[PDB]
Design a binder for this molecule. Structure first.
Ligand SMILES: CC(C)COC(=O)c1ccc2c(c1)/C(=N/Nc1ccc(S(N)(=O)=O)cc1)C(=O)N2
Length: 280
């Protein structure tokens, strides 16, 4: 790690602390992540797998530094996250063509991960990175106050062996947030998160989600709320966007649209790649 000059702290995550840093030998500007822990052998193999999971919409893992019984991940650096961009665009809103481009690119990144049986598990605006070229990239995955706003209901209900559908749920929540300029389900506890989902989409039952009542944390005593219309949930999003969002937010993970099928949805018929106005 003596090969890198730290410039500034850019974040703190579940797995560790991230710095903007400069390689003293190549002059390369990178994101250096110090992993929070000797390093287990299983961790080294799983991280070695991430190195090969390369795609234009996945933040590149340049190098894995396992020296002096410490672990550092050297990543590609991007200048802004979607959280800061959404905050900067709050007065006017992100233009719909740019929302659509970002959603389309992230679904391409997800379809790629998911085809290699790799789940993100914790998508959120803070780990979605953007550049001046109009690209958006997935970061902070592959090592498996905590934000619960994007957590799929099967995780909250105690599913131990959840699927790639949890990522589709998170991305649908982020899509809604880009459109409305407000978090869709801003829970501040696991039950508040669950009940916020239930108040908008209706308390799930065996009809809409077969097997829901036998889930580890399901309680028959859950209040029974009626579902709201999507026209009320994400105005002024057009019918194509609302249709896609409804499929990304299906309760049953088996009914929830896949990343590959979402890419063929009519909402992306007129997709383009606009360039954002970034203030760096
Ligand atoms: C810390 C938590 C999420 C875990 O993060 C990661 O594992 C991780 C991995 C590789 C990365 C980055 C983060 C990163 N971050 N860059 C950045 C740059 C500017 C702003 S900001 N807020 O708009 O000024 C925010 C983020 C980057 O470039 N490569």
């Amino acid at each position: 790690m003596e090969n890198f000059q730290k410039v500034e702290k850019i974040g703190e995550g579940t797995y560790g602390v991230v710095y903007k840093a400069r390689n003293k030998l190549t002059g390369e500007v990178v994101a250096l992540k110090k992993i929070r822990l000797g390093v287990p052998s299983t961790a080294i193999r799983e991280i070695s797998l991430l190195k090969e999971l390369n795609h234009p919409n996945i933040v590149k893992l340049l190098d894995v530094i396992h020296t002096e019984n410490k672990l550092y991940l050297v990543f590609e650096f991007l200048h802004q996250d979607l959280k800061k961009f959404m905050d900067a665009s709050a007065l006017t809103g992100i233009p719909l063509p740019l929302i659509k481009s970002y959603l389309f690119q992230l679904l391409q990144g997800l379809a790629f991960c998911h085809s290699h049986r790799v789940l993100h598990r914790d998508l959120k605006p803070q780990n979605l990175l953007i550049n001046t070229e109009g690209a958006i990239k997935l970061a902070d995955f592959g090592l498996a106050v905590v934000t619960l706003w994007y957590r799929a209901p099967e995780i909250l209900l105690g599913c131990k062996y959840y699927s790639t559908a949890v990522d589709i749920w998170s991305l649908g929540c982020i899509f809604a947030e880009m459109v409305t300029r407000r978090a869709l389900f801003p829970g501040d506890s696991e039950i508040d998160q669950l009940f916020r989902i239930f108040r908008t989409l209706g308390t799930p039952d065996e009809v809409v989600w077969p097997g829901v009542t036998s889930m580890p944390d399901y309680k028959p005593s859950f209040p029974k709320w009626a579902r709201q219309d999507f026209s009320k949930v994400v105005p002024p999003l057009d019918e194509d966007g609302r249709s896609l969002l409804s499929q990304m937010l299906h309760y049953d993970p088996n009914k929830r649209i896949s990343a590959k099928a979402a890419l063929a949805h009519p909402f992306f018929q007129d997709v383009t790649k606009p360039v954002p106005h970034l203030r760096l």
